[PDB]
Design an enzyme around this catalytic site. Structure first.
Site, PDB file in Angstrom:
ATOM      1  N   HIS A 351      48.672  26.404  48.257  1.00 22.85           N
ATOM      2  CA  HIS A 351      48.015  27.342  47.348  1.00 22.85           C
ATOM      3  C   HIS A 351      48.698  27.496  45.987  1.00 22.85           C
ATOM      4  O   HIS A 351      48.346  28.387  45.243  1.00 22.85           O
ATOM      5  CB  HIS A 351      47.917  28.742  47.989  1.00 22.85           C
ATOM      6  CG  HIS A 351      47.175  28.796  49.286  1.00 22.85           C
ATOM      7  ND1 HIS A 351      45.877  29.244  49.380  1.00 22.85           N
ATOM      8  CD2 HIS A 351      47.573  28.517  50.554  1.00 22.85           C
ATOM      9  CE1 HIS A 351      45.503  29.227  50.651  1.00 22.85           C
ATOM     10  NE2 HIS A 351      46.518  28.796  51.381  1.00 22.85           N
ATOM     11  N   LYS A 542      43.532  41.441  38.503  1.00 22.38           N
ATOM     12  CA  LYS A 542      44.303  40.431  39.228  1.00 22.38           C
ATOM     13  C   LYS A 542      45.765  40.877  39.145  1.00 22.38           C
ATOM     14  O   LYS A 542      46.130  41.713  38.311  1.00 22.38           O
ATOM     15  CB  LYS A 542      44.147  39.020  38.641  1.00 22.38           C
ATOM     16  CG  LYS A 542      44.398  38.898  37.139  1.00 22.38           C
ATOM     17  CD  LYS A 542      44.043  37.528  36.539  1.00 22.38           C
ATOM     18  CE  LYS A 542      42.543  37.258  36.452  1.00 22.38           C
ATOM     19  NZ  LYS A 542      42.089  36.173  37.361  1.00 22.38           N
ATOM     20  N   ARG A 543      46.623  40.293  39.969  1.00 23.85           N
ATOM     21  CA  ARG A 543      48.036  40.606  39.887  1.00 23.85           C
ATOM     22  C   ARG A 543      48.609  40.300  38.495  1.00 23.85           C
ATOM     23  O   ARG A 543      48.185  39.348  37.812  1.00 23.85           O
ATOM     24  CB  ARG A 543      48.816  39.856  40.968  1.00 23.85           C
ATOM     25  CG  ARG A 543      48.517  40.345  42.376  1.00 23.85           C
ATOM     26  CD  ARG A 543      49.101  41.741  42.627  1.00 23.85           C
ATOM     27  NE  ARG A 543      50.566  41.736  42.522  1.00 23.85           N
ATOM     28  CZ  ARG A 543      51.418  41.728  43.553  1.00 23.85           C
ATOM     29  NH1 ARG A 543      50.990  41.723  44.827  1.00 23.85           N
ATOM     30  NH2 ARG A 543      52.718  41.709  43.305  1.00 23.85           N
ATOM     31  N   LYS A 548      48.991  34.171  34.470  1.00 23.18           N
ATOM     32  CA  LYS A 548      47.633  34.682  34.354  1.00 23.18           C
ATOM     33  C   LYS A 548      47.289  35.189  32.938  1.00 23.18           C
ATOM     34  O   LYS A 548      46.113  35.419  32.615  1.00 23.18           O
ATOM     35  CB  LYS A 548      47.385  35.763  35.407  1.00 23.18           C
ATOM     36  CG  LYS A 548      47.409  35.202  36.847  1.00 23.18           C
ATOM     37  CD  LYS A 548      47.314  36.309  37.890  1.00 23.18           C
ATOM     38  CE  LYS A 548      47.461  35.865  39.348  1.00 23.18           C
ATOM     39  NZ  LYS A 548      46.226  35.188  39.851  1.00 23.18           N
ATOM     40  N   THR A 650      39.912  33.366  43.050  1.00 20.33           N
ATOM     41  CA  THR A 650      38.744  33.839  43.784  1.00 20.33           C
ATOM     42  C   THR A 650      38.084  35.062  43.157  1.00 20.33           C
ATOM     43  O   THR A 650      36.882  35.269  43.343  1.00 20.33           O
ATOM     44  CB  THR A 650      39.092  34.168  45.246  1.00 20.33           C
ATOM     45  OG1 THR A 650      40.191  35.078  45.256  1.00 20.33           O
ATOM     46  CG2 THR A 650      39.470  32.933  45.989  1.00 20.33           C
ATOM     47  N   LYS A 654      33.906  36.179  42.562  1.00 23.35           N
ATOM     48  CA  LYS A 654      33.355  37.516  42.806  1.00 23.35           C
ATOM     49  C   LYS A 654      32.573  37.999  41.600  1.00 23.35           C
ATOM     50  O   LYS A 654      31.515  38.626  41.741  1.00 23.35           O
ATOM     51  CB  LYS A 654      34.445  38.542  43.143  1.00 23.35           C
ATOM     52  CG  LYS A 654      35.310  38.201  44.368  1.00 23.35           C
ATOM     53  CD  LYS A 654      36.539  39.106  44.457  1.00 23.35           C
ATOM     54  CE  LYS A 654      37.572  38.509  45.389  1.00 23.35           C
ATOM     55  NZ  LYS A 654      38.792  39.290  45.401  1.00 23.35           N
TER      56      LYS A 654
END
Ligand code: IMP
Ligand code: IMP
Ligand code: B1N
Ligand code: B1N
Ligand code: PLP
Ligand code: PLP
EC number: 2.4.1.1
Lengths: 810, 810
Positions: A351, A542-543, A548, A650, A654
């Protein structure tokens, strides 16, 4: 009320009301006169649970009789969220429960809000495990999720003075009505000790014993009467443990700490002994359970025909040497036969490619904690390297690169290399990520055994992520194409024939508007904050992580603020910019990013010249239940990781399912989403993977961007000089210094293209009809991203079992 | 089957069977095909629990409406034992449940044996609290028991190589179906901190907070539909506790250790900080609950009219200064008014005069842990001593003796003196003990306030200790005099008119014989040991302590052995000598006594010349459920404490009710038992209290007895020379040295009279008809020893409430 929520028949409503009152009286020991809303939530949960039970018993009975191949999904994380509504959806009880509770004078929506999230994961990896369990049950697979029942899940986040504070998530305080303790299937797990070599093989002796007690949770499939099991292990001391007297009893906590708390890191490896204990605990208890079930049906040749073990990253990688230990030391199989069985049984999903996320355990830790496993790892390595040497003779550097044992100041075991060696299948989680694995970090392994390497693009369950969280959208879809899409999401393609239908365009926009009003009201009630629901809802949840690039979003927000202040009387499309997520407690830079986001809000939200044209909100305590609220309300989904870093994503999927457009880089599953929808229906910007590589070869120099882009220079000068922190002018110097001199994720390199792309977003939002048509094109092509598709591929291409949509009898 | 077990009506049996199957399916999530006996036990327990619930709710509702005076019984110990059978007895469900389970193919007796004892006490003090709760409910009093829910109760005792080993009593492992967690009534408890003095009084600040979470257990009265509550507090850390991150979460154990384990000392004070925390925890949580309930009805003048607090020894003595703290610091009452309220509310029961058992806390511990309480204690002391000085002017030595503060190397607070000062009533637990209190240790207090001092002779509940454990005896009694005696035990006097009735004599002896056979079979099955059930069963079961003189019994057993070996062909009445009980883990001499008992067994039980004329058995793991088995089987009850040391005893009373004769000293309640039955129907021997005092004034010299009694000299020479420990000849030198040079309990001084009295026992046992007639005279006069009598006296003479035998509606 709405069709997709099922029937509210008089018999069913009457029966639910009877049972609700029965549980309130007998189970909760309350009368209506002192019952609180929490008591009513529990009475409803027990009532709904009773409907699972018969199906759960019959399903497990059915597997005992038919003896299908069993799938064991091993994970350190299962991010389940709330259970009540999902259970009602999957049993077609939602409208009946609504009616029953309504007749008792109660609002079911209010009762749902009382339930705690089961927060037993950090983010995407744990939530993927949860979606997968839902899909495995919906597809009739004889599947078991195995993990740890943490007493404390992911911490609750509070923001104080703009800073993250952490509070323990005491999720079990009021009880968990969904689980069933099974103290009767308690099993021993061994630690420490030493190895002695007899004439009759190796024996692991003088060990400390911790007991693993299982708790079972039902996992209902979608309207097929299948109920599978999630089995979570809790640590218990044996009763002779340490046995002055008082201290010996209190020291039982040392053993029981194994299951106490979830490590709260996302995409980061922390090599602590307690984490290693957790990993072995889950593996050792699970494997005994697997073998017990296999024997209740000598001949381990059939083991891989009856058992598949899927490793969710390397966290349960000790399954490989544990399986060898049991087969060789306890069952007395010869090494080669045991290895054949092991490889055919195990498969590994990777992952991440971030180097700081890969598990590399110090040999000295394994030597002390798991001395027999270390011997087995060394033997695996020697035999594996003998194969490498035979295939690539004289290639000494390849032997060093491929070794399970890394040399250095501290010798370490590379767990990813162990997983590849001991698995018949290795997969990534999106096409670009699986290609990166073959070209970069696992290139050598791919050359040796190309047949092992696969792709399985991630997905999300449309039960939780459409029907449950966005009933209004589910219903208007169902009015046109029926209900079959809920378990066959590819049927959403039929919506492309409604892209020019005026009534459908209106309904899609109406549902979004309703979701926005509902979320704007939620914010006001729970967090004392006022947002314009006509503004574009621009959402990044998101984290918090450097890769990111929440910081890139911050740069855009400041850019918009500065443009407004420069020309205040010009029209701009109003935005509400919402950013949320948790930072790992030890991750200093992530904590500083949170503080920057709140500090930007402090300036922007109180500037009278801005008005309600721009608002910046930090969404506190982002978790599964908050995702279910904010995602249906979003207009724009921010998916802006540096190309090559987000293995899949993911959250992205969504948002696509729920009627937001996406602004994003060509990273992870964004590539496949753009391919499905058409690039013209996606806001793509920035460096591709190849462009990042070209920059790395030349050398990334952030100063070049600073010197060439005046708008960027202005922002950096504002950060450095104390514009966003007047009382502490140097508060953000660590952020500035990182951006200017050691930014691994090249924030400045995508800044110009990002801002230009954001201008195109605003232009489209001004034409609501065309915005909504583009939305329909995204929702219509989101079918590939069902976790039902993902799981059918694992089933056929890895596990060797056929999915089924057939119902068990009710 | 038998009348006192109630009706087995067809409707009731049908309904119980339905509900049993409902709980097996829905509550336990099992089908019959995989259910174990433990699953069946739980299904039955849940079925019986459902019958309590309606009554529990209605009872608590009734108290809210009527607002009677509430009785709060505060104890660190509640030795409850098993609940299933007691609940069935009190609800008249026993025969119906027997029939229901029989029709399902199950044996209810076997299911009962699966339930764990709730072992939340050490012995007599904790068991008295349990009997009292049963009597308070049976007498319709609005009573609440308040304590601590220990995770680990009294340790399980294993004997290994003749030595006690301790194992944790993990009584909650499989769940407790009787309790209901009430996390909604969780309350904060404060520790440490410091006191600051404002102009608006004292404030206790900078404290550490631990949460007290209540668990409620129902307490059913005997066939009156009253169900009272036992509320036990469990310690929980707050969620911001210590809040790197992982360590802060793991350190929550420091707060939660407060409720982890019961201190396993009987009649011994261990001044550890953790024990002090436990004492304050129970008091602080309980008092907040009491005050909340009082306010839900400013005017604290009525507090003593609505509230009684009974202190079970000094263990909850901090209630006195805590009540003052709340009234003065929080409610702002003037000191004198608050003190008036406190004294009228509180009453204190003393349970021991042994000096090493009295709580005397070091001032430095209280200063650190409870600084405000220490200030309040000092103020109480100064005001109390001012009264003493006014009543007895110039008596400076009296001021020193009566002070709450003891001077010395370490300053200590005498908690018994605090309890006397702050209570309106002080009682002992048997007539001789209450007299000893007034003449010796509390003489000064009695002279100041004679009106405070009372007696309340202890009792036992005839539900558990006759009907439940000895149904055969209950039934043959009921055939003659009806069932009313079960709640009015004085009616047993009617049995004196059957002392010459041949059929009654036969039935009494038959029931004993049946109980002996059943116990002899229990021993064989569970412990691989073979006993002659025609022998006299000579039983001493109680905690191991020097004052209880298990060693005197040992001396008699060796005496019998030596007499047999001297004249092997002479007839002697066969005996099985059974001794059981737990030693506190740190009490070395008590552990040595256990080893001596097993070592005597090792010699005696394997000597072929003895045969089955003499057997010595150590009964392992003595606890409430074992008492229920062995007491109905006993012929002779050993109650042989040194006069002046056993405050009451309650085992004594259990044996009297169940058809054993008593050999005992004139100590505790033995005095009153002998008075009720007639001294001619009791085997009394040894020094009276006055004789012990005379010996102490002259000086006890054990050597004198050794020199004068050849049989005693022989025994001491056998112990010293290694006759009972061939491989370790000096193993018992600590015992010999204690007996010869520092025996506080004068074992040798009662030896000759004890042996002679034992010869009279054997002579009577040879004439079964006369033995049994004497038994009838004991059972017939045991009525005074009902805890219903005890509780009616507390109610009328201390609490100011009237008991009631009236039934609430069903
Ligand atoms: O010996 C057996 N007889 C009948 N059914 C069994 C037996 N052992 C297991 N089962 C079935 O399988 C069990 C499921 O738990 P498992 O054994 O952990 O898979 C039960 O629910 C039974 O339905
Ligand atoms: O405000 C109220 N209305 C009605 N009944 C109450 C109220 N407060 C307490 N009670 C009753 O008393 C409670 C018993 O718990 P307690 O309050 O801890 O004594 C409930 O079971 C109710 O029956
Ligand atoms: O494939 C599902 C998700 O796994 C996420 C991901 N999480 C972790 C991880 C979590 C905890 C930990 O201790 C160490 C690594 N690795 N990868 C990916 O970042 C995301 O792209 C992906 O959609
Ligand atoms: O009145 C009932 C019983 O209390 C027993 C008794 N137990 C204790 C005690 C228990 C635990 C502890 O930590 C400190 C003292 N004191 N007294 C008496 O010995 C017994 O005679 C009496 O029947
Ligand atoms: C889906 C989800 C994630 C993963 O989102 P990404 O944007 O893919 O990182 C994280 N946390 C929660 C609570 C989620 O529901
Ligand atoms: C009654 C009882 C006691 C008290 O017995 P004494 O002989 O009075 O010390 C101790 N332990 C248990 C288990 C009891 O039932």
């Amino acid at each position: 009320q709405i069709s997709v929520r099922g029937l509210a028949g008089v018999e069913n409503v009457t029966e639910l009301k009877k049972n609700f009152n029965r549980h309130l009286h007998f189970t909760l020991v309350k009368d209506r006169n002192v019952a609180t809303p929490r008591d009513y939530y529990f009475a409803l949960a027990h009532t709904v649970r009773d409907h699972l039970v018969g199906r759960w018993i019959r399903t497990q009975q059915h597997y005992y009789e038919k003896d299908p191949k069993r799938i064991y999904y091993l994970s350190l994380e299962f991010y389940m969220g709330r259970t009540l509504q999902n259970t009602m959806v999957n049993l077609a009880l939602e409208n009946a429960c609504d009616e029953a509770t309504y007749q008792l004078g109660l609002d079911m929506e209010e009762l749902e809000e009382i339930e705690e999230d089961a927060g037993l994961g950090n983010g995407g990896l744990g939530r993927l495990a949860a979606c997968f369990l839902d899909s495995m049950a919906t597809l009739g697979l004889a599947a078991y999720g195995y993990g740890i029942r943490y007493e404390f899940g992911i911490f609750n986040q509070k923001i104080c003075g703009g800073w993250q504070m952490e509070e323990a998530d005491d999720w079990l305080r009021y009880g968990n009505p969904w689980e069933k303790a099974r103290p009767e299937f308690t099993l021993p797990v061994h630690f420490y000790g030493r190895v002695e070599h007899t004439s009759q093989g190796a024996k692991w002796v003088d060990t400390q014993v911790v007991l693993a007690m299982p708790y079972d949770t039902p996992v209902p499939g979608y309207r097929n009467n299948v109920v599978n099991t999630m089995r979570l292990w809790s640590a218990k001391a044996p009763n002779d443990f340490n046995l002055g007297y008082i201290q010996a009893v209190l020291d039982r906590n040392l053993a029981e700490n194994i299951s106490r708390v979830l490590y709260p890191n996302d995409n980061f490896f922390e090599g602590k002994e307690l984490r290693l204990k957790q990993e072995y605990f889950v593996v050792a208890a699970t494997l005994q359970d697997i073998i017990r079930r296999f024997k209740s049906s000598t001949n381990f040749d059939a083991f891989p025909d009856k058992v598949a073990i899927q490793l969710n990253d390397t966290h349960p990688s000790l399954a490989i040497p544990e399986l060898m230990r049991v087969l060789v030391d306890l069952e007395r199989l010869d090494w080669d036969k045991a290895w054949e069985v092991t490889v055919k049984t195990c498969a590994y999903t990777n992952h991440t490619v971030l180097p700081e996320a890969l598990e590399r355990w110090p040999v000295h830790l394994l030597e002390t904690l798991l001395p027999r496993h270390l011997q087995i790892i060394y033997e695996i390595n020697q035999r594996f390297l003998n194969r490498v040497a035979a295939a690539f003779p004289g290639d000494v550097d390849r032997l060093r690169r491929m070794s399970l044992v890394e040399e250095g100041a501290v010798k370490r075991i590379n767990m990813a290399h162990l997983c590849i060696a001991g698995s018949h299948a290795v997969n990534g989680v999106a096409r670009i990520h699986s290609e990166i694995l073959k070209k970069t970090i696992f290139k050598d392994f791919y050359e040796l055994e190309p047949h092992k390497f696969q792709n399985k693009t991630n997905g999300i369950t449309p039960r939780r992520w459409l029907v449950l969280c966005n009933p209004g959208l589910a219903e208007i879809i169902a009015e046109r194409i029926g209900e079959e899409y809920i378990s066959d999401l590819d049927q959403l393609r039929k919506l492309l024939s409604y892209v020019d239908d005026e009534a459908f365009i209106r309904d899609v926009a109406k549902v979004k508007q309703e979701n926005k009003l509902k979320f704007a009201a939620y914010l006001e009630r729970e967090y004392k904050v006022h947002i314009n629901p006509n503004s574009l809802f621009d959402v990044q949840v998101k984290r918090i992580h450097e890769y990111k690039r929440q910081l890139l979003n911050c740069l855009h927000v400041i850019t918009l603020y500065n443009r407004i202040k420069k020309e205040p009387n010009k029209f701009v499309v109003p935005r509400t910019v919402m950013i949320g997520g948790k930072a790992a407690p030890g991750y200093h830079m992530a904590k500083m990013i949170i503080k920057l986001i709140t500090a930007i809000g402090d300036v922007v939200n109180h500037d009278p010249v801005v008005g309600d044209r721009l608002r910046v909100i930090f969404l506190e305590n982002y978790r599964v239940s908050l995702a279910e609220k904010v995602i249906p309300a979003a207009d724009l989904s921010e998916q802006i990781s540096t190309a090559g870093t987000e293995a899949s994503g993911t959250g992205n999927m969504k948002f696509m399912l729920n009627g937001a457009l996406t602004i994003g880089t060509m990273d992870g599953a964004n590539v496949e989403m753009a391919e499905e929808a058409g690039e013209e229906n996606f806001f793509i910007f920035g460096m591709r993977v190849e462009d990042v590589d070209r920059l790395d070869q030349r050398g990334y120099n952030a100063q070049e961007y600073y010197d060439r882009i005046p708008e960027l220079r202005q922002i950096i000068e504002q950060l450095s000089s104390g514009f966003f922190s007047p009382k502490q002018p140097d508060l953000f110097k660590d952020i500035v210094n990182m951006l200017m001199h050691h930014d691994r994720f090249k924030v400045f390199a995508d800044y110009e293209e990002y801002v230009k792309c954001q201008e195109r977003v605003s232009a489209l939002y001004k034409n609501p009809r065309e915005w909504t048509r583009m939305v329909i094109r995204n929702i219509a092509t989101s079918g590939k991203f069902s976790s039902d598709r993902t799981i059918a591929q694992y089933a056929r291409e890895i596990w060797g079992v056929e999915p089924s949509r057939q119902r068990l009898p009710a």
